[PDB]
């Protein structure tokens, strides 16, 4: 009863799913799991001047995201990654910007924006030829190792690893440069997932297209293995203007595939693939940091 990833992706899209709370101009960089049968969503916020983070009050249906409470974190967790770490029965929120390049906090209740532990170092390395430094981390474990993947707004994708038994912990400064292309082709927003029912991992990377932001996909048989381009052009993207079915945005940008199993394996079901992304009105201009990003959800057409 298993499904495979398609060679060509076709989606349908929701409209804009929520408007930012008073004081914010954008909701961004989503990470989501299903928790107690409800959607649990963290994201970045922007006021235009400063970036913060938030969690939505849990909601069962995407169509009710618009009415969900928006709960600011007292300490910013920009571009967050949320998961449940089963081997230690603890939730993890990883993010960027703070005392170290990447940071994490832990909790027993991921619904509380302010119930997270003191910040701990996740990654302390540095990259060359980048205006941003390490950005847009994700974490994913198989049965043996925990992996860190990240970007640099510079055409490179990077990876680090540790035995799972040493996590939660600090990857330190070391990393592997696993992919190298143009800045436009491998920009940011990297995510990695286990494809349920297949001996396959899925990587998506946000690219800058002629028509807007879009995602390029790659596959691997192992998390330490090589990545083969799948749907990796603007005309044949993982998700973008070409195939999103979205009428409100020409950009499909930093988000997360919907993870029903909240655990560290980042497993997605190819039979019911959905993508919580950020988009924006095509008419919106101004400084990048003030852009009015909004959540939407793509559902894969089978």
Q: Would you say 159 or 241 has its CB closer to Cl ion? A: 159
Collapse the DSSP code of 66 into the 3-class scheme (helix H, G, I; strand E, B; otherwise coil) and give the result: helix
Residue from 28, 39, 156, 159 that binds Cl ion (CB under 5 A)?
159
Number of residues that bind Cl ion (CB under 5 A): 3
- Stretch of residues binding Cl ion (CB under 5 A), selected from 9-17, 27-35, 171-179, 252-260: 171-179
Q: What CA–CA distances, in Å, run from 116 to 32, 35, 106, 121?
A: 17, 17, 5, 14
- Stretch of residues binding Cl ion (CB under 5 A), selected from 12-20, 105-113, 170-178, 212-220: 170-178
- Stretch of residues binding Cl ion (CB under 5 A), selected from 46-54, 169-177, 194-202, 212-220: 169-177
- Stretch of residues binding Cl ion (CB under 5 A), selected from 6-14, 113-121, 127-135, 153-161: 153-161
Position of tokens 């927003």? 189
Does residue 173 belong to the site contacting Cl ion (CB under 5 A)?
A: no
Residue from 31, 96, 138, 161 that binds Cl ion (CB under 5 A)?
161
Sheet holding 70-72, edge to edge: 26-35, 38-46, 51-56, 70-72
Core vs surface per residue 117-148: b (16+ CB within 10 A) or e: eebbbbbebebeebeebbbbbbbbbbeebbbb
Q: CB of 159: closest distance to Cl ion in angstroms?
A: 5
Q: Which of residues 15-44 bind Cl ion (CB under 5 A)?
A: none
Collapse the DSSP code of 42 into the 3-class scheme (helix H, G, I; strand E, B; otherwise coil) and give the result: strand
Does residue 144 belong to the site contacting Cl ion (CB under 5 A)?
A: no
Phi, psi of 253 (to 5 degrees): -135, 175
The CB-nearest residue to Cl ion is 161
Does residue 138 belong to the site contacting Cl ion (CB under 5 A)?
A: no
Residue from 12, 174, 176, 289 that binds Cl ion (CB under 5 A)?
176
Q: Please name every residue paired with 31 in a beta bridge, in sequence order, or none if there are none.
A: 42
Cβ count within 10 A of residue 162: 16
Q: Would you say 77 or 164 has its CB closer to Cl ion? A: 164
Euclidean distance between CA atoms 234 and 262, whole angstroms: 30
Collapse the DSSP code of 20 into the 3-class scheme (helix H, G, I; strand E, B; otherwise coil) and give the result: coil
Q: CB of 52: closest distance to Cl ion in angstroms?
A: 31
Does residue 230 belong to the site contacting Cl ion (CB under 5 A)?
A: no
Q: Are 72 and 94 in contact (CB under 8 A)?
A: no
Q: Would you say 159 or 194 has its CB closer to Cl ion? A: 159
Which residue ranges make up the site for Cl ion (CB under 5 A)?
159, 161, 176
């Amino acid at each position: 009863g298993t499904c495979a990833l398609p060679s060509t992706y076709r989606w349908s899209s929701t409209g804009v799913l929520a408007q930012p709370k008073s004081g914010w101009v954008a909701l961004k960089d989503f990470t989501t799991v299903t928790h107690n049968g409800r959607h649990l969503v963290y994201g970045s916020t922007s006021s235009g001047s400063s970036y913060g983070s938030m969690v939505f009050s849990p909601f069962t249906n995407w169509s009710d995201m618009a009415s969900a409470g928006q709960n600011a974190m007292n300490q910013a967790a920009v571009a967050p990654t949320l998961f449940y770490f089963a081997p230690k029965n603890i939730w993890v929120l990883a993010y960027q910007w703070g005392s170290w390049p990447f940071i994490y906090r832990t909790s027993s209740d991921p619904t509380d924006p302010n119930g997270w532990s003191a910040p701990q170092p996740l990654f302390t390395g540095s990259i060359s030829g980048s205006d941003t430094g390490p950005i847009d981390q994700t974490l994913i474990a198989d049965g043996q190792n925990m992996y860190l993947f990240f970007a640099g707004d510079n055409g490179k994708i990077y990876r680090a690893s540790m035995p799972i038994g040493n996590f939660p912990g600090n990857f330190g400064s070391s990393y592997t440069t696993i992919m190298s292309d143009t800045k436009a082709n491998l920009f940011e927003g990297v995510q990695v997932y286990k494809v349920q029912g297949q001996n396959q991992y899925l990587m998506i990377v946000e690219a800058m297209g002629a028509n807007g932001r879009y995602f390029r996909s790659f596959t691997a048989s192992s998390l330490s293995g090589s990545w083969t381009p799948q749907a990796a052009s603007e005309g044949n993207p993982f998700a973008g203007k070409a195939n999103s079915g979205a009428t409100w945005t020409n950009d499909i940008s930093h988000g997360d595939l919907v993870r029903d199993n909240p655990d560290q394996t980042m497993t997605v079901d190819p039979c019911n693939l959905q993508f919580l992304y950020q988009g924006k009105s095509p008419n919106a201009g101004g400084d990048y940091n003030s852009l009015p990003w909004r959540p939407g959800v793509l559902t894969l057409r089978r």
